Amino acid sequence: FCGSMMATGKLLVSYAPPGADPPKKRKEAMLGTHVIWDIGLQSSCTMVVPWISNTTYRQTIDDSFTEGGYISVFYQTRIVVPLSTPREMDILGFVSACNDFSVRLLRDTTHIEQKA
Amino acid sequence: AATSRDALPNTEASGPTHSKEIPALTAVETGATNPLVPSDTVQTRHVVQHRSRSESSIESFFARGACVTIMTVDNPASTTNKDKLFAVWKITYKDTVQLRRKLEFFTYSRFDMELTFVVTANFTETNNGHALNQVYQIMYVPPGAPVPEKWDDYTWQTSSNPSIFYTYGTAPARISVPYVGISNAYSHFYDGFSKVPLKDQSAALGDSLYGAASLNDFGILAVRVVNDHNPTKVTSKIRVYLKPKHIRVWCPRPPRAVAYYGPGVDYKDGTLTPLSTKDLTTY
Amino acid sequence: AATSRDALPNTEASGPTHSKEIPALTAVETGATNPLVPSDTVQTRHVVQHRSRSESSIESFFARGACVTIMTVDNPASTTNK
Amino acid sequence: GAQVSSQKVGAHESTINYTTINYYRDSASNAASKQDFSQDPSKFTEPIKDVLIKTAPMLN
């Protein structure tokens, strides 16, 4: 959370494993894996997306057989600020792997080319 | 500890019988097959049995390279209007029929795959020209890596994809690959879809092929002639042979009885009469 | 002694929680990444983990020949001007 | 690292052996040993919950 010290808020961060309607309302997102983040001195909050898959490994491309589900964020209460305070701000998000995370089958990337 | 090459059981000598034990009588509704041997219904002699089931072990039944595809490439004159043909094949055992029928005696399998490549070339025009010995590049492009759009574009660099540079007229190329499935076994049959159609979404959007899992299951092989264009055009074929080494199989199945029609279990009208005429009381 | 082909850590079963320990709360300004595992924010079962990082070791990531150049040469007729 | 095993000799001209050395790190690269095991057909031929005695009535 990058708003001011005077800004408060509760947000809901969600992970819904695949197979149902992708959550568009807090009502749905609540029902899946989630964290309710209370903004304060510990500036950041972490949600762990646990390995939940039918296959033992997923593909590194879009694939419906090995789909992973839905990450989403909602307002739990609302951002509240006093007067003389910015009413808008930014949050920044980060991703990283847990210690149980692995990859295999080495391959060339599409993220670089050499036309001509 | 009973091994595939061990001799089968000896026939034991047995004499006449008159009792309440009824081996011959049974009831197949139970779902079991009566475990009988000849000494149960006739008089037998003693035979020391030497025969073994060594060649019908799963490994032995499969221990053969089977052709699964024929790839075509060329190297034309630089003056041609048509592009230089490179080949792209989706890896599968279902483009041909014989290894397919053998694997489908079973529902699931695990094996290490041995691929062997036989390459042959010929002249196409009644020229009187030449080409020099060719080198082929057989590139594995796994799902997600960039597929070649041109015989000479950047993807043939292969910094991370595995490639074989095969020289014409040398011993056929061969590599091995471990059990690479994303499941605990390969599934020869998948009774399902890769997408659930949701009500709240359009039918088109929820649609997928019956019995298909991952659209690009195992990626592709891309083959090219590395030599530059030659005045005389040469055409080549790369025949791919598949052998399943170190194999395990699960859940037996009746073999394919009517002709294959696509990668699924579908059948074509007009092919559904395998059996022939034979009279009930005719030997 | 941990090697590239060793299996990664087992997921340990964990139950409900109500305490002052706050794994989910953190502060990225410090420059560190929160070392969390699923049993920190959800209930887990016990899983015996078999997967390994063998193919993403530096050696394995690089263990491939890559084309770095294409050199051109010829051998012409002795009569050529070039 | 040499593995030495016996051949089952069919046509004859003691035990004859043969030698195997694996040249690669990946078990996938290895030839097939053909040292395989047989098993009982029971899971397909006798899948009944109550053990069948062949001399007895299958139904009682």
Add this chain to the structure above:
Amino acid sequence: GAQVSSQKVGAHESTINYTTINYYRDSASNAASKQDFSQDPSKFTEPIKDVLIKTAPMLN
């Protein structure tokens, strides 16, 4: 001078081994063993001067 090591066997048909002999004097000529070690990510993931306990406030 033969080096004997175990393979990690993936698909199965004891320990299977493989053999390696170096044919040249220069270590540069040798194949890659792929016998590599892993290490903890800490120098990149936790480079803080004071040890982080994840259940505790990162800021106190």
Add this chain to the structure above:
Amino acid sequence: GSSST
């Protein structure tokens, strides 16, 4: 060295 089966 040697394994014997």
Add this chain to the structure above:
Amino acid sequence: GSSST
């Protein structure tokens, strides 16, 4: 002779 890993 032999080293065994």
Add this chain to the structure above:
Amino acid sequence: EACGYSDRVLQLTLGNSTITTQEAANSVVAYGRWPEYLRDSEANPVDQPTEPDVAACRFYTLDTVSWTKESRGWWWKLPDALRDMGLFGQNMYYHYLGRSGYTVHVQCNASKFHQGALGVFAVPEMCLAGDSNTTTMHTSYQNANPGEKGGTFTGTFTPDNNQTSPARRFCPVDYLLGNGTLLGNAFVFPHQIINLRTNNCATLVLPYVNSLSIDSMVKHNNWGIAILPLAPLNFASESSPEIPITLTIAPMCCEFNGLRNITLPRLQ
């Protein structure tokens, strides 16, 4: 037993439900494997599973069908056939993943004067063939998944010629087991026969079978139950005999992972 116990007389009890039978032909445990929960050594999704136990592992009776001289056969898929059955179906649509074994009890009584024989087959991955000769692998989800009504076999292949709006359904030909292989061999799959003079039911105990430890129940069926008349229904000298066939199936050792909002599938 000299205290009366018989092969033919069984009682099965799961949850709040009991089945009694006095004309059984023993019972079958597919591949000799009784159903089991997923072991830690084979586990894959790491979240705590739900095991609903007696609320889902109980005998659900499906809609009764009718066997006549013209019947060519019937089929169902699992877990599809049970998708709407009590808390089992609920557990199924609420979770990404699920696995389950099953006790299948097929019921069919008649009289000592009737005759006929049903082959009752449990097939792993029972992929059935489509109705088209213009497009392979095109049976729609809705038609692949009849739910508890099941589907039927046909003695004739009639290809769907409406290319504008294709039927997009199966066309399972009976002597071909609906999948291009001969019915006479379906006995290599776990089975029993209901032969009216001998027994009035079939009982198959089925383990979870799959190339994975757990999977999408909504996307994939693990087993197919196929019932075909091996010998036709016949009675006295009546030309139109009918006897009912009832299916009762119980899920066993079932567990679910990946809880979210409920799946609401397009089924018609």
Add this chain to the structure above:
Amino acid sequence: EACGYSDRVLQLTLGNSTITTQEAANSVVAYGRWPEYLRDSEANPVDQPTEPDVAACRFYTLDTVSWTKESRGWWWKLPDALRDMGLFGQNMYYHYLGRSGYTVHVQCNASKFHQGALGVFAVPEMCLAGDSNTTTMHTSYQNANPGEKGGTFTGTFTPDNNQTSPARRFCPVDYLLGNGTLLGNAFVFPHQIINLRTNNCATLVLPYVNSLSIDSMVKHNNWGIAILPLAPLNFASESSPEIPITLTIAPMCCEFNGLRNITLPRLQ
């Protein structure tokens, strides 16, 4: 703690859900009793219970309401408020009997410049008074059971005079705790206060409380959650301040007996 642990900073984790808070005022365990499953020594229905565990014992967030200068208070009943929440509600309507404890987490943040105080009360058997002076005990089932929207308190008793077609609903007067007793004493029930300068949440862990070991969840509510403004909302010099209040409740150690077909109640 000299490693940083605070009374004010808590993390609660049930099922696939986590709640974090940095401005708590400890948490309450009603009557000092943590929730528990029914012991054999106190058991009554003899059938195997279903314990859905993580599929039902997880944090369900209800609809958010809004606190303003005119708010008189809000109420919910348990298990009624949760009747439509995932597999908990399903387990509830499928069984004759059920019992459950709950973690109640009420959420309300503001700023160091706002003020106000909510009394959050957990009341066993929270019987509320009706709107009528012609007929006692006549609040209809539908009105007694709002589901997750809850109800509200009023500062005024307005008796229902339509004798032809009575409203048949509650008329819960706030200084009378909606039940004819003074609000100033509701503190003898398990409670916390959300006083905006001190804390931004209330957390009550509630045991199953009843004169029986297990009962009809559909017919009877065990607890009532009542939230009233003890000191009114106020901010800066604004005349119409508003801050949201969110309820999140998790069932705990819940078990169900008497499985049959699902209950389908008349709720409107």
Add this chain to the structure above:
Amino acid sequence: EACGYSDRVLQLTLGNSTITTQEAANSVVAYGRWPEYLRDSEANPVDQPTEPDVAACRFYTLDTVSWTKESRGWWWKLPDALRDMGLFGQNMYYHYLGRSGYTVHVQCNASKFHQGALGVFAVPEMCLAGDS
């Protein structure tokens, strides 16, 4: 600590200089390696090194810049940024060779009513792209 010690309140002292802070977010030791002198086993030039110690290993404050809504970012290189700082810079220009570690302390205070976030990155071999 129950005697008051905090993650947020630090004092660093090098040479004749001290930095105090009451709103720190711990501190970072790049790649977990504290700075060190060159070891004999890794040495290369054979001449006696000069180690100026406190005369060069002390806090030099650079020119203050200003962060506004239009700021896109700033960069410096080391040792370049310090080339003109006291006896460090002198030692640098008098010798063919030199090596050094660094404590970098970036300072920026505001108020409980302001907001914004600066990413402060230490990059080894920070080669930047040209204008052409």
